[PDB]
Amino acid sequence: VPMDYSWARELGLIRKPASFMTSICDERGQELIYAGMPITEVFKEEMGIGGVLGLLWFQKRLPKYSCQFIEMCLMVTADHGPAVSGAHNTIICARAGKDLVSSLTSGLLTIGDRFGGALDAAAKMFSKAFDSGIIPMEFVNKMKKEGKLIMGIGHRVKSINNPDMRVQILKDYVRQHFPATPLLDYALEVEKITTSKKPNLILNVDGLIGVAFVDMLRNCGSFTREEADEYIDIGALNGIFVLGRSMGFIGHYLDQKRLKQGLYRHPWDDISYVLPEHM
Amino acid sequence: VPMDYSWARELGLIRKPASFMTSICDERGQELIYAGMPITEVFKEEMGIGGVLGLLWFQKRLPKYSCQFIEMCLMVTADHGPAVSGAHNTIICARAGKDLVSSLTSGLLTIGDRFGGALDAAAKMFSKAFDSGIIPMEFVNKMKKEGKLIMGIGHRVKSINNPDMRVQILKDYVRQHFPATPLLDYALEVEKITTSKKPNLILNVDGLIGVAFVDMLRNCGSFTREEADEYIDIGALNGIFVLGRSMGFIGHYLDQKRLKQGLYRHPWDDISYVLPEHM
Amino acid sequence: SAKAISEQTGKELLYKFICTTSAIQNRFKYARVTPDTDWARLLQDHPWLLSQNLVVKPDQLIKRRGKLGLVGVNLTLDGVKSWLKPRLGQEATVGKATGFLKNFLIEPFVPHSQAEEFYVCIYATREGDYVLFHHEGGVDVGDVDAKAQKLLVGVDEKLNPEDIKKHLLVHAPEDKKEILASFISGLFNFYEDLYFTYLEINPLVVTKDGVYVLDLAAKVDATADYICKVKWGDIEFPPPFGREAYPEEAYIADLDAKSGASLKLTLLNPKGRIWTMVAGGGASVVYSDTICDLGGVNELANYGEYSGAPSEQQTYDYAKTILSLMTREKHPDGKILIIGGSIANFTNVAATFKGIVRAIRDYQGPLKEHEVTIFVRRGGPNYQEGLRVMGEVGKTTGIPIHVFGTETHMTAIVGMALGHRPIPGKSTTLFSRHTKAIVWGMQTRAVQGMLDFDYVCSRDEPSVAAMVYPFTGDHKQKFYWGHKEILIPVFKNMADAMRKHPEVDVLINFASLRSAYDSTMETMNYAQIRTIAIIAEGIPEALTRKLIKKADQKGVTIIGPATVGGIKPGCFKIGNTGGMLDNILASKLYRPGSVAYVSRSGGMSNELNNIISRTTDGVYEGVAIGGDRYPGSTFMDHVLRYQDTPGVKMIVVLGEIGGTEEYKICRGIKEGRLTKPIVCWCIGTCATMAGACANQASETAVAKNQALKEAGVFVPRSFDELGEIIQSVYEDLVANGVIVPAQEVPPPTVPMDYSWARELGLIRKPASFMTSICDERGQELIYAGMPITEVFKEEMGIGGVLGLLWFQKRLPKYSCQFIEMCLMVTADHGPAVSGAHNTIICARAGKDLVSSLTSGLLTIGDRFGGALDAAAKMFSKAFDSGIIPMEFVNKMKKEGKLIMGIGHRVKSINNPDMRVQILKDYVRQHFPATPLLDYALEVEKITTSKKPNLILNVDGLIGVAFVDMLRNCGSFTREEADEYIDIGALNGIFVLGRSMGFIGHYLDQKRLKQGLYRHPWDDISYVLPEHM
Amino acid sequence: VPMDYSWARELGLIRKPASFMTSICDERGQELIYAGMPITEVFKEEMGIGGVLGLLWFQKRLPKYSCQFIEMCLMVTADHGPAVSGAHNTIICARAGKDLVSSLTSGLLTIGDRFGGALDAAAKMFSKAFDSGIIPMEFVNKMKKEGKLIMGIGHRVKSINNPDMRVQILKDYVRQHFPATPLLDYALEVEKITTSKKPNLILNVDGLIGVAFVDMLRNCGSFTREEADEYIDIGALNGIFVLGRSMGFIGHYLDQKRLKQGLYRHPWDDISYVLPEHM
Ligand SMILES: CC(=O)SCCNC(=O)CCNC(=O)[C@H](O)C(C)(C)COP(=O)(O)OP(=O)(O)OC[C@H]1O[C@@H](n2cnc3c(N)ncnc32)[C@H](O)[C@@H]1OP(=O)(O)O
């Protein structure tokens, strides 16, 4: 009979090249370990949900203001009503009798470039503007020259003495608690200009979270500024939006399931079929 | 140094209990093998797309009428307009700038019990009615007694001298080509009672495909009638709907992407928010 | 808008930015007492004051200070101090104006003889810039067009110093000729490098040492700040020398820049019984002229204005300022408030009326006391419903309110109120039946208005052929043509829009003020465009003159800037002119008539449409040349277009003060070019003590109306009988037999829009999509009933907004903290587990965050991640049916089911799970009552006696502690608490917790840069059939 | 009372700007209409599943050879064994007790750029090479110069007198039935050039389907080249792969559900955790 592989490996006479290299959890052994931090060390060292996003995503002890700011970003992103595209898809999937996972999932797949992509795009735009020299008056004019809108700037109603008021809370926190905010100050000059163009072009919350998150990564400790670009270039700022808005999508699922609403069918006079006359 | 595993196995001194038991493809070796049938044997033995659904799902040579009928079922299921729930989700996800896979996927997750579930439910209902004795007049009355609608019966407009006309094509094919159709004849004695109740309660295509598919499995060769209940009990009839309607969902994605339509946002006066006054 | 600046600021900008070979002495040698600073900081920071002799002037926009003597010349400090005492901070007057004599400039006195003061003045005219010089300086410069040398220089032209020496410096002293030849060229390059409208150096002391500037008057184009805000910096436009503002006027002055809107108030007399509340900027002039014309000139109170359709609260605030101010002192003849106005183009009249009537009902007490009488006239979209509801509040609170519609004359109400009348290669055709237009900008409302006008006037094709919007790719916008839907191609560049529609000859440039210039020039590079209509307001006058020069070079007709557009009924309508189709159908603008008007303000074209509609046949063509001081086409360019046109039979001209323009009309009748009857009336006859600018005695409405009266143009005395005289001359031309009235055909009718009807409430449409967890509309996000600032102010965690968004309740502090902990322990459990495996596979095939997280979350079902809901349901069903734990374990044993939520693999007893232990500790110290946890712990105390590794999992203790939380704390009623378990709120806890770990696994696999995974063939064991 | 919107709209005094412009199905009316073609006209005019992909995706009557070729492409793409990434995800999701839709969906989301992206990439690469002049010897050298592999070329075992043998069937069909095959001949010349370098760099089926599909679109009738570049630029060739491989993924779901296989958990000695020692 051949030797058993678990018994052969035990005495260690064999290699096997293990795939699936991972570095954010150690579910074996005595107790659960997140980064190098056991779960009891997570709980008795005071660190919040933002603390375990620091441990699981960025693999670092973030300081307490950064953990509370990550918590703030997940709070403000949580829901923006059911009219928007992803929550619409969750309501349709929940209303057709599906699960929590399928309804959440069918809503989450909408989150892309047009919906929910203003976080990562508004971070990348302003970061590439700020670390390549450009003064804000040249940056606004340059995005006017090639005809692209500035992502993270523009709100449909809220202009002047009428702030977004979840931008106001995040801006107050970032002024009060962060040590240094360079890219925020550039995002507020290049917005102190764009409001003078037309008054309702304030910073979005989708732009404020992006610039303050890039500012948080490259301004606090434990990020080397060339890793702090790695997480933004990967798409860690999409993760903030998706984890934040999963809260509201599951809320929409539970709400549509609790109201006992039947299957949706879109009305025929909101379609305008333009089929070819004979193909 | 330890011995290399692939080299320890090659000359065969070791076991390893292989998981992932599979039986529908052999991608290794000389050429691709679907069931026991190489791909050249698939192509030069005349067998259609329904032939390779027979090979990949049910793992059998289905006869040519059954392969053509599977092709017919995939043809009629292909699209039913954009107003329906799943194609709505595909249009929303495609219109928010996502991929083909994410738009198709966000539409496919709607396919459940209320949308797209009439195939498997209408098959299971009529099969459990027919193999448990019950005469059609007692079956209609019995589903009246416990207050459940008969799945696969009922169409919103099409009643009498106004057939579904894709039910008509499938019914003509099943009469002309199938050897024996017991459960179809029971499903038509039940539609010929229920149309006499109210005339627009004809067989759906969602009920005709289910009863003719159960009839195809347990009536043609190579199915033993505990295998032929196994595939219906698993949900192979959901697979017919999902593979059929993936065609129309990808068509809706390509159509919405070709028309260059911007991000959707549902209008606020089609919502009627009923939030609590103070929580 | 040419706004004057103080001579300190003009001196400062001159000393900063001048570029000449001359040495400008006394550079930054100026101080400014600002009769209210101290007398020591100014004498130390500018320590040159003790070094020379001095001079003091007032820099408060005072004109001709050398005649009446507000100047203090050639003294020392204390003589000047004494002067400043009987000056620095009390009343003084010049001409007519009286006021506090505030700001004084102080200059070091230059020793000058009378042979060295010179005179230079550069002012902007329409055809260029005029530089003007006189070498016999001082105040006695004499006449300015005869002896003082003028020199026009064109626009986008360079003034050569050879030109200054040869044309302008002829009678200069020969010793001081080349220093001035440098100075004038440097001063002109300063002049047009900044955007000055008017610069005045009088006098100009040029000695052997160099050049000394002493007094300047500068008016700068204040709308050009977007070019020169870095160059002016902190520019200050002082108000002209007058009285002090009231404590209501400053309230409206900072109510001005509160929303984008025009809110103006200037009081003529605060004891005046006649008060105006008039919408529309031209109507505030016309109403004031009609009141002043009818004996109310000393009893008119102000010249109020509201425009831009401000908010209900904002119009409430302006209305409370205007109604409060007339209750200060009464008058035995009674007091009148006049809610005037022209037709509003698109604004719902009813809502602004709701604001005004809420203000009236808010101040109803003193209004009944003081005997105010309100005369109201308004028109527009839904003007009727507003008029009825304001008659309703006039019946409610007892104040006499007389409401009037579009049928009555707009200024008939002020004669009814006083009681004088009783109370009851440029082309001669621009638009045709077949002209297409290209709209520059995403202006779907204006384009839809144009298509609606084209459908109602029985026109065969839409006149919007394409749209150009440079901020998005080419697509098709979906518009309405009648009741069916058509597609209008939206382009990105201009060139492809011109190539794909080569027969377009009209462009409507809806660009903003700072990008209208280059967009219009880029348009003018294409020669198929014959007319451009510039809608933007606030384009600087230098760019407007450059556009005018290239239009006269290329033969293109510019209508604008600051216009609403023009309308040719039956043919074409430029954007927003006329209003929506209520005003088009009401003024009968779907068919052509025989009367053509030219108006200057865009807001008065609607009232001219009314007067022509109700008195005569109808409008044939009406263009608004715009509000700018340099219109692209003047009056004289359009009356010649109409006189050449055979379709018209009479021409109406509505002029204002400013620009010698109606004297060209006088010359046109004088030499007989204009033979068709012209009725004209220049509004702005408020002389009883851009637009309006550089006015002489001949530039006033009285002198202009006198000149056109004597020249043969029919002129009415006031605006009231403009309708009467236009009907009189219409009867003249139908009695003579040249005007024939064609028969009225009914027009094609359009459906009313859904938004309009829905907003004006006549249609109810059943709304699907009931929701209760977010209110995105309104001012603030509302989660359950909480605004988002109430969420952050109360410091309620992520568990708090899970309570708000999922359960719609305020959970207590321990429950929010517990939900945070049970998300935290659920966060990730390694990559070997099934869902994290799927996320690693999908992330490792190069997918996004959403696709990888999604492909992992879809594993979360009944076997993986289903222990939460199933363990909570099983223990809830065991506890609620009153089964003791010893019987519950056996009843699971007899049914052949494992107790879900109990059983761990390695860690058992005195080796616990250690995150079960944390949650169990928290639930013991913080929960008020724990029945279900106690039941689950006794079931654990049995099944660990069975086998020691059968403890409560975290997947079972989160379930029983969550059901324990739901049915054991407050705010849940045990039929809501059981419902949320059956819906699957415990699946949501697991999915939201594990999403953190799955996104972490995605980021970890993406950051390690690991490539595509193919599962090894040695781990498969294919069991294919033999030969199917 | 206000007027009812359906009654208001009916007699037509009102507009409402209908969103959701669509052009591939007309589920209202007498009978189902795919492009301009009713469903009876689909069935009695002989046209296959490839015919209704022609109607639903490209909105045209494709000729019978093109419909049969689309059917061929869906046949060969159907499965390539369970070891590959997407079928692996379907087996994991099916083995954890999920639905057909969730298992299919969790497998389909793998289909991206590294798995299943060789179709669209191999089409775009060769099309941009062929319509920009470049001779094949310069094209191979140019993709050597900038260090990119040629997508759709390279097979792990099958080299010379050992063809892919589903490439052979498609190549035989394209030679026999297509009218003109320019881009295939350029892909064939290039294939030959690459093979002479190292013999196992033949055309993949993932490259042959891409070049023959671009050839089919721009070579048969009813496609103007600009609008035939539209469908390739959108990603219609991803749709062929996804609709083809959905067959095998549903087969893998039904197979894993029929074998009654329990929950999968990856072995711990195939992971190699590299967690930080203390974070
Ligand atoms: C009573 C009566 O009606 S009669 C009085 C008649 N008088 C008039 O004509 C006044 C009419 N005025 C107007 O209506 C306006 O000036 C209009 C119609 C020209 C529209 O102008 P606006 O609305 O300011 O232009 P727009 O909407 O394009 O916004 C302007 C700027 O926003 C900028 N912008 C917008 N969004 C963004 C963004 N997201 N990021 C960056 N920049 C942005 C645009 O780029 C544009 O900048 P630019 O000025 O460099 O082009």
Ligand SMILES: O=C([O-])CC(=O)C(=O)O
């Ligand atoms: O997050 C986004 O980009 C979209 C959204 O919710 C909003 O409309 O504010």
Ligand SMILES: O=C([O-])CC(=O)C(=O)O
């Ligand atoms: O065919 C289906 O099952 C879905 C559908 O069209 C309908 O609900 O009308």
Ligand SMILES: O=C([O-])CC(=O)C(=O)O
């Ligand atoms: O849009 C316009 O030009 C007119 C308008 O809305 C208003 O009167 O407020």
Ligand SMILES: O=C([O-])CC(=O)C(=O)O
């Ligand atoms: O919650 C589950 O069912 C799966 C899990 O985390 C475990 O492996 O313990």
Ligand SMILES: O=C([O-])CC(=O)C(=O)O
């Ligand atoms: O298509 C792919 O990229 C993967 C594939 O079929 C295989 O290698 O088995």
